Amino acid sequence: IAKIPLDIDTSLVSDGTATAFDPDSLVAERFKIDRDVPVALQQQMSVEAPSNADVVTFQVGTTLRRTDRQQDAGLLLALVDTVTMNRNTAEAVLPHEGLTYRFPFDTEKKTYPFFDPIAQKAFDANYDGEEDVNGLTTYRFVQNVGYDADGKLADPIKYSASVTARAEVWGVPGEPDESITMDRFYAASRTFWVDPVSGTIVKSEEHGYQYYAREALKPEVTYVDFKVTTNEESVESQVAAASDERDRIALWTR
Ligand SMILES: [Xe]
Ligand SMILES: [Xe]
Ligand SMILES: [Xe]
User: What superkingdom does the record give (predicted)?
Assistant: First the structure.
């Protein structure tokens, strides 16, 4: 019925709060962890080569920054991702699988595989109900990565990463000047609000958690624990884009 357009160029922002390690304390006497820090997650998406009649490539740059700092300070996380997807299905075709940044046209009330770029694997995005978003009826989907159905930490992803520091520097118990090596782990939970016609994700809520531990289910030191939601302006921009796409599709479909 339709193809993902080749002229997508969006910059979306999600605001929220985090507990975060201060990267500027890496060589300090004690690793500094700041609580209840305001943050902004910015996602910039642009179309790149290869894109043609069949496929579309998106380059996505994502940053998480503290908003109680000026522009040269407070960068917490940065990720660049590149994916080529089928223009008709939105499915991925470094190797990605399933949905990544959009749902298919005529999205159904069912489970979809949705890629997590840190886990480097697709996890179920389960249908969770209908909800109005700025006058548009959307389908809500929920994806858990490392958390079970009850929201308990169960299978966090171990990064392939490790950090070695004295117990006094980590701020954990230990023998005097004991050297401790901890692995980095990741777990996340996301909610997507989807326009069922165009498949556009008009709003998202994301709760990301990265920490250091000797054992996966016994987190010891937080790297980042953030919860963000797409801001009003970004939701309005996506609802407008989805609405334009829907108006165009309505002209040649039944
Ligand atoms: Xe990020
Ligand atoms: Xe660290
Ligand atoms: Xe850390």
Answer: Bacteria
